[PDB]
Design a protein around this ligand. Structure first.
Ligand SMILES: O=P(O)(O)Oc1cc(OP(=O)(O)O)c(OP(=O)(O)O)cc1OP(=O)(O)O
Length: 309
C-alpha cells in the first residue's frame, strides 16, 4: 500500500483561570465561529491556587473545569477524551472526534516543575505526546516565571521543561523521547513574557490607538526568540488582539489595584513542525471569570494516513 498526507482541524487553547471555578459557559472560547475541530488541545493555568493543591493533593477544580470544557466543545461532533495531565494548577486536555480515536496510539503524559527551588509545580509545564495515524504529535502547556524583570528565569524555565521532559518509547535502547523528537509540536500556556522599556501609560495608550505592531516591537518573547535564547525554530502568528493581562475579575477594565499592573501578552500559542497552517489567532474578551483572557488558535495540520485496498 502507500501513505498520503490528509489535513486535520486542530484546536489549541490556553486560559489562566486564576484559581477560580467556571462561572461562564466555555462555548464562546472553545466553539464560537468555528467548524467542529478534529482534535482539541485545551490547556490551563492556576486551576487551583490553594495550599492543599500546592502540596500535590487532589482538587474539585479538576472535574469542575473538565465538565465545563466538555460541554463548551463543538455540538456538531461527539468528542472522546484521549488524556488528562495536571501538575498542581497546570492542566492539559486532549479530545478527538470519536471517528479518530481508533487511529490514536502511543499516548504519553509527563510533568516538569520549574517553580520554587526550580522543582515545585507552582510554575512549570505539562505535556501530552501521541501518534495520530502515522504522525508523532506533542502538545505542551507551560506556565513560566512571573514579573517583568524575570525574563532570564523564563528562558531557563523553557530550557528546563525541554531538557527534563522525557517520554518513554517502545525501544528501550533508543535515547528518551524529548519534545523536539516529534513531527508536530504545539506549545501553549501562560508564558508570562511582558512588555519592556515602555511606561504603563504608553502601553495603555498604544492599546487604545490599537497599534499592536508598535507594542509588539517591545515584546520580551519576540526579543528573546530573536536572540535565539527561547523557542528556537518555533513560529508564532501575528498578534491582532489586545494583551490578555491584567483585568479586574468580572470586567474588561485594566487592573485597578494598588499594584496597577501594566498590560502584557502573557498567553501565547507557538508551533514547530512540517505541514502546519494557522487559520486563526484570537483572544476572548467575553469571558470575565479571571484577570486573564482565554486565547485560541485553529490549525490545518497534515497527517500521514495509510491507503489500503
Ligand atoms: O510488507 P508487505 O506484506 O509486502 O506489504 C503489505 C503489508 C500489509 O500489512 P500486513 O503486514 O500484511 O498485515 C498489507 O495488509 P493490508 O491489506 O494493507 O491490510 C498489505 C501489503 O501489501 P499490499 O496488499 O498493500 O500491496
Amino acid at each position: 500500500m502507500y501513505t498520503y498526507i490528509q489535513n486535520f482541524r486542530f484546536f489549541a487553547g490556553t486560559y489562566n483561570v486564576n484559581g477560580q471555578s467556571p462561572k461562564e459557559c466555555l462555548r464562546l472560547w472553545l466553539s464560537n465561529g468555528i467548524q467542529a475541530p478534529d482534535v482539541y488541545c485545551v490547556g490551563f493555568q492556576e486551576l487551583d491556587l490553594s495550599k492543599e493543591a500546592f502540596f500535590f493533593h487532589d482538587t474539585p477544580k479538576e472535574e469542575e473545569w473538565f465538565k465545563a470544557v466538555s460541554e463548551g466543545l463543538h455540538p456538531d461532533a461527539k468528542y472522546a477524551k484521549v488524556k488528562l495531565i495536571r501538575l498542581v494548577g497546570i492542566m492539559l486536555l486532549l479530545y478527538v472526534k470519536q471517528e479518530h480515536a481508533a487511529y490514536i496510539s502511543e499516548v504519553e503524559a509527563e510533568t516538569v516543575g520549574t517553580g520554587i527551588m526550580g522543582r515545585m509545580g507552582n510554575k512549570g509545564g505539562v505535556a501530552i505526546r501521541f501518534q495520530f495515524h502515522n504522525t508523532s504529535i506533542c502538545v505542551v502547556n507551560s506556565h513560566l516565571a512571573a514579573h517583568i524583570e524575570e525574563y532570564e528565569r523564563r528562558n531557563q524555565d523553557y530550557k528546563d521543561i525541554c531538557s527534563r521532559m522525557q517520554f518513554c518509547q517502545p525501544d528501550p535502547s533508543l535515547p528518551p523521547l524529548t519534545i523536539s523528537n516529534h513531527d508536530v509540536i504545539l506549545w501553549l500556556g501562560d508564558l508570562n513574557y511582558r512588555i519592556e522599556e515602555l511606561d504603563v501609560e504608553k502601553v495603555k495608550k498604544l492599546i487604545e490607538e490599537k497599534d499592536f505592531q508598535m507594542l509588539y516591537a517591545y515584546d520580551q518573547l519576540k526579543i528573546q526568540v530573536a536572540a535565539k535564547t527561547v523557542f528556537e525554530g518555533f513560529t508564532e502568528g501575528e498578534l491582532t488582539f489586545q494583551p490578555t493581562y491584567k483585568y479586574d475579575t468580572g470586567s474588561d477594565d485594566w487592573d485597578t489595584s494598588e499594584k496597577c499592573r501594566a498590560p502584557a501578552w502573557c498567553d501565547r500559542i507557538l508551533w514547530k513542525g512540517k505541514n502546519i497552517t494557522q487559520l486563526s489567532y484570537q483572544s476572548h474578551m467575553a469571558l470575565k471569570t479571571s484577570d486573564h483572557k482565554p486565547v485560541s488558535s485553529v490549525f490545518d495540520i497534515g497527517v500521514r494516513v495509510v491507503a489500503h485496498h
